[PDB]
Amino acid sequence: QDLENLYFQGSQINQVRPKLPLLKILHAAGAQGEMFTVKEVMHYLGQYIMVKQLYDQQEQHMVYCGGDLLGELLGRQSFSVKDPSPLYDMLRKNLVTL
Numbered sequence: 001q002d003l004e005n006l007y008f009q010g011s012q013i014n015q016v017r018p019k020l021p022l023l024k025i026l027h028a029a030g031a032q033g034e035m036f037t038v039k040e041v042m043h044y045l046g047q048y049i050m051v052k053q054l055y056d057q058q059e060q061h062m063v064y065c066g067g068d069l070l071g072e073l074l075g076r077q078s079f080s081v082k083d084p085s086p087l088y089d090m091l092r093k094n095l096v097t098l
C-alpha cells in the first residue's frame with residue numbers, strides 16, 4: 001500500500017476554506033472557525049436555510065433565497081433541493097481546497 005498511502009497523504013479528510021461571503025453564512029448557522037469538511041458545509045447550509053426560514057413550509061424542498069446573501073451567492077431567487085445544480089456550482093466556486 002506504499003504508493004496508495006503516499007498518494008492519499010494529506011488528502012484523507014479534504015478540508016476546505018469557504019470564501020468570505022459563504023463563511024459568513026456558515027457562521028450565521030452556528031459554525032465556528034474557517035476550516036470545514038464539505039459534509040460540515042452542507043450541514044451548516046441546511047441549518048442556515050432552516051434558521052432563516054427560507055424554505056416553503058408547504059413545499060419544503062423549495063428554497064426562496066432571493067431575499068438573502070445566499071441568493072446572491074447562488075445567483076438565484078429560488079431553487080429546489082430536487083435539482084441542486086446551482087448549489088454544486090456555487091460550492092465549486094466558493095470552497096478552496098486546503
Ligand SMILES: COc1ccc(C2=N[C@@H](c3ccc(Cl)cc3)[C@@H](c3ccc(Cl)cc3)N2C(=O)N2CCNC(=O)C2)c(OC(C)C)c1
Nearest residue numbers: 042043045046047049050055060061062063081084087088
Ligand atoms: C422535502 O424537503 C426537504 C428534503 C431535503 C432537504 C435537504 N436535502 C439536503 C441536501 C440537498 C442538496 C444537496 Cl446538494 C445536499 C444536501 C439538505 C440541504 C443541504 C444544503 C442545502 Cl443548501 C439545502 C438542503 N436538506 C436539509 O437541510 N434538510 C433535510 C431534511 N430535513 C431537514 O431538517 C433539513 C430539505 O432541505 C431544506 C430545504 C428544508 C428539504
